[PDB]
Amino acid sequence: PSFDEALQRVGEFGRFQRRVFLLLCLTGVTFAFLFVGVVFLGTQPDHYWCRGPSAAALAERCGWSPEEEWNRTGRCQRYLLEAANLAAFPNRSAPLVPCRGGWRYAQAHSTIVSEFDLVCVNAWMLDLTQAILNLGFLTGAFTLGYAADRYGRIVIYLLSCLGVGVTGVVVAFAPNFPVFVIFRFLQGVFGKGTWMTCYVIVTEIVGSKQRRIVGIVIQMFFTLGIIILPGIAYFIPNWQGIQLAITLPSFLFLLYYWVVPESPRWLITRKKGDKALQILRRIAKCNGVTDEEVSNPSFLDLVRTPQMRKCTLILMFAWFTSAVVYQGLVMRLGIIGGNLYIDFFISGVVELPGALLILLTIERLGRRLPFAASNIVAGVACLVTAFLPEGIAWLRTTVATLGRLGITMAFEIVYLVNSELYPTTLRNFGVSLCSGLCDFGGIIAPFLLFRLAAVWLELPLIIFGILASICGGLVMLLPETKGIALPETVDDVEK
């Protein structure tokens, strides 16, 4: 309780904590860049085709542009002039033959598809990048939680920032596909640590009050990164340029070092004490206990107390359900506006009003009610999209978008309440352990969607709606985490 009085004497919001807030929100923006920017990596080429050695030789000796070459001849099989022994075919009597390799591309924009030749039979492994990135997210969460709890928050934050920067530079200059995949897996490993660590530190540094502003505003910065990603993607077209621009700000964030102290409350576990008091004194620019050391956290110790176990299980299931429901709704949406950049910009922009509603609502009504309402709205939208007369009304897309907004609002509220729920020691371990489960949902979603859609078109939507509708009990079983600051050690289970 003296720590609460310590923050009362100096803290809450000052100039220092505001500057730290903006500085870490920058890292949130960069993590948002990393999480989605693959959709602008390897955008599908307008035309792709394969040519034989004779066709390539004659094309080079005549020097025509790829556009007319594709026009006269994307297809995965090509005619062969070798069998024949300005049109090459007089009457297309030459048979067509499938090609194992040698295909080229026509569009001038640079994509990972052009460099790594991910088309035809290799078009399978374009989503392999998705799976590997999400698996890297999962494993990086799982291990970096323990890494950041064993050491301090700031050291692991800085190390993860350096790792993200260097692995991104390596990926930008990957010579072959296996190197690209391995180092992008590693980038996903390190990328998960930065976001979780920055969220936990910015939650710890502020007191019990105005913590909801902290969480919701950093989520708004994540959404801002999503919104602004089309800007850089459109302005600089080259793949290498886009990845370089995404990854270099990690070094600038690595420049922090002495700017941001790790956490007073992290060190108040009688690990250091004197360093904590020094940090508090350094905080107080404007104005002039003892317990058993948890030390290394244990995964089994993460689930040992019935209330602790209940919180862990409900949080994990909510994460997984949100992931699968969001994937289903996004697949249902398709394309809006006829443009990729415009669609992405609109999708990002419409995310903000939900965040504003959350920011204005959490204090008055708590946190359980808006979260339950968001999940219920998502489930009802899923069911309504499933059952309606053949989609003869323009309300399919509106209902799907409304459900997506509801599930994103739930995604934002859960990421905060997850942070408050866990103890101080287990905080960065328990958090990102559930994000591991949402990453697992992300990897498993396409297979489940295809399998269920094989049986019936609207079965996945029905299942997702039921999963979302379970929230009525799922989140009602939570303790509302209102005005109780952040629980210390095993005092999480008092409620």
Residue with tokens 């009304």: 393
Helix axes 395-421, 177-205, angle to 10 degrees: 60
Give the domain ranges of the chain: 1-44+122-477
Tokens standing for 246? 């995404």
For 259, residues 6+ apart whose C-beta sits below 8 A from its C-beta are 20, 23
Amino acid identity of residue 487, one-letter, is P
Q: How many CB atoms sit inside 10 A of residue 132's CB?
A: 18
Residue with tokens 């290799």: 122
Residue with tokens 């019990």: 208
Helix axes 15-36, 153-172, angle to 10 degrees: 40
In 3D space, the residue among 405, 302, 250, 286 whose CA is nearest the CA of residue 9 turns out to be: 286
C-alpha distances (whole Å) from 141 to each of 127, 351, 406 are 21, 25, 26
The C-alpha atoms of residue 140 and residue 192 are separated, in whole angstroms, by: 6
Helix axes 177-205, 211-235, angle to 10 degrees: 150
Helix axes 126-150, 153-172, angle to 10 degrees: 160
Do 137 and 84 form a contact (C-beta atoms < 8 A)? Answer: no
The C-alpha atoms of residue 337 and residue 327 are separated, in whole angstroms, by: 20
Residue 379 backbone dihedrals phi, psi, to 5 degrees? -65, -45
The C-alpha atoms of residue 231 and residue 336 are separated, in whole angstroms, by: 18
Tokens standing for 390? 């053949």
Q: What is the resolution of this structure in A?
A: 3.2
C-alpha distances (whole Å) from 106 to each of 48, 69, 73, 110, 112 are 6, 9, 13, 10, 14
Instruction: Identify the sign of the CA torsion 345, 348, 352, 354.
Output: positive
Q: Are strands 103-105 and 96-98 parallel, antiparallel or unpaired?
A: unpaired
In 3D space, the residue among 166, 172, 182, 186 whose CA is nearest the CA of residue 239 turns out to be: 172
**Residue 151 Cα to chain centre, angstroms:** 25
Helix axes 126-150, 177-205, angle to 10 degrees: 40
Q: Are strands 48-50 and 103-105 parallel, antiparallel or unpaired?
A: antiparallel
- Show the CA angle centred on residue 188, arms to residues 218 and 223, nearest 5°: 25
Amino acid identity of residue 454, one-letter, is A
Do 243 and 372 form a contact (C-beta atoms < 8 A)? Answer: no
For the chain, the maximum distance between any two Cα atoms, rounded to a whole number of angstroms, is 92
In 3D space, the residue among 180, 162, 139 whose CA is nearest the CA of residue 41 turns out to be: 180
* Superfamily of 1-44+122-477 according to CATH: MFS general substrate transporter like domains (1.20.1250.20)
The C-alpha atoms of residue 81 and residue 51 are separated, in whole angstroms, by: 10
In 3D space, the residue among 421, 415, 454, 429 whose CA is nearest the CA of residue 142 turns out to be: 429
In 3D space, the residue among 164, 426, 208, 114 whose CA is nearest the CA of residue 297 turns out to be: 426
Written in H, E and C, the secondary structure of the chain is CHHHHHHHHCCCCCHHHHHHHHHHHHHHHHHHHHHHHHHHCCCCCCCEEECCHHHHHHHHHHCCCHHHHHHHCCCCEEECHHHHCCCCCCCCCCCEEECCCCEEECCCCCCHHHHHCCCHHHHHHHHHHHHHHHHHHHHHHHHHHHHHHHCCHHHHHHHHHHHHHHHHHHHHCCCCHHHHHHHHHHHHHHHHHHHHHHHHHHHHHCCCCCHHHHHHHHHHHHHHHHHHHHHHHHHCCCHHHHHHHHHCHHHHHHCCHHHCCCCHHHHCCCCCCHHHHHHHHHHCCCCCCCCCCCCCCCHHHHCCCHHHHHHHHHHHHHHHHHHHHHHHHHHHHCCCCCCHHHHHHHHHHCHHHHHHHHHHHHHHHCCHHHHHHHHHHHHHHHHHHHCCCCCCCCHHHHHHHHHHHHHHHHHHHHHHHHHHHCCCCCHHHHCCHHHHHHHHHHHHHHHHHHHHHHHCCCHHHHHHHHHHHCHHHHCCCCCCCCCCCCCCHHHHCCC
Q: Exposed e or buried b for every residue in 70-81, given b needs 16+ CB within 10 A?
A: beebeeeebbbb
Do 14 and 205 form a contact (C-beta atoms < 8 A)? Answer: no
Q: What is the CA radius of gyration of the chain?
A: 26
Do 265 and 424 form a contact (C-beta atoms < 8 A)? Answer: yes
The C-alpha atoms of residue 56 and residue 66 are separated, in whole angstroms, by: 11
C-alpha distances (whole Å) from 192 to each of 51, 136, 160, 266, 466 are 42, 8, 8, 20, 30
First to last CA, the chain: 17
Please count the CA atoms within 13 angstroms of the CA of 74 that sit on its side-chain side.
27
Give residues preceding each break in the chain, C–N over 2.5 A: 73, 85, 288
The C-alpha atoms of residue 140 and residue 78 are separated, in whole angstroms, by: 43
Q: Are strands 77-79 and 96-98 parallel, antiparallel or unpaired?
A: antiparallel
The C-alpha atoms of residue 13 and residue 358 are separated, in whole angstroms, by: 20
The C-alpha atoms of residue 184 and residue 172 are separated, in whole angstroms, by: 10
